[PDB]
Each structure stands twice: as structure tokens, then as C-alpha cells.
Amino acid sequence: XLLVXAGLVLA
């Protein structure tokens, strides 16, 4: 998808 994460990047 459209996330802004730090480590486990998801859809």
C-alpha cells in the first residue's frame, strides 16, 4: 500500500 514505515515495509 502507501505506508511510511521503519523496518518492516508493508503493502
Added chain:
Amino acid sequence: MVNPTVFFDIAVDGEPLGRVSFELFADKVPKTAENFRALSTGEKGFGYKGSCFHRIIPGFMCQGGDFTRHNGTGGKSIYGEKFEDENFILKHTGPGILSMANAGPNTNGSQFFICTAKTEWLDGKHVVFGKVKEGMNIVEAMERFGSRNGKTSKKITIADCGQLE
């Protein structure tokens, strides 16, 4: 307190591109703003200078601030390895918004993103703490080096950074 202003001097594969400045909303989120400010000046002996934007998605955002691992797994705050979500008073209203990347609730480190669109779905999950003042066109220029999966075709870098006011 007057909201502080910081700048990034951006480079593309070493070549200067331009300057982006940000207003930091210390009047809403003083702790979150202070962390970004200090990391931008390097006054704690570490920070954003020389770091890269590891993940850029055109039409979405530019992500950077990982100055220890340069890939999304690193960075630290001036308060320690992580700090809490200060508040969610401010929202992701449009291009230029400056907001904290995280790995779920209360895991703010040093990673951030500059929005190139309104990102409403992120409201309440990511702490908004600033907005681009000058050089949005430079952000737009940075954006063209990203891709749908985030990978950048050129090394986008913070050649220099500091506080203007």
C-alpha cells in the same frame, strides 16, 4: 517561542540540486520539532548531514532521516532509540507536509517523510511536525529519482543542513 526554520541542501549523486527549508511546528509539537531541529544542526554530535533519502515514491512522499543504516532500519532520536507520539493535533494536509516515519505506535526515531501529496490515511498514525517553506520545486525534482517501490535511480543526499532561524 517562534517556530524554528531549518534547511537541507540537496545533492543528486554528489551534484548540488537546491535548498529546501522547513518551518517546524514547535508551537504544537515542541518535542518532535526539537528532535528534527537538533539532528539538522548536528549539535548532539550526530544527525542528518550526509544522510540519504532511501525511499522515494513519486506522487506520495520522500523518506529519509536514517543516518545510521541508510535503509529504513536505523536512525535514533536525541532522546534515545525511540520516543512517543507527542500528539496528532496536525494532519497530513498536502504537499510539503513534514511528518515522522515510524514502526507503529510510539517508535519515533529520526526518520521522517516530506509529502508530495495529501496523505489523509496517515492522520492519527504519524506525527506531523513541519512543512516546506521554500524549495518545494527541489522536492519535486528529488521525486523524479524515486520509483513505485521506493528505490531511487540516483543517490539523493543531504549534502548540508542546519538552522536558519
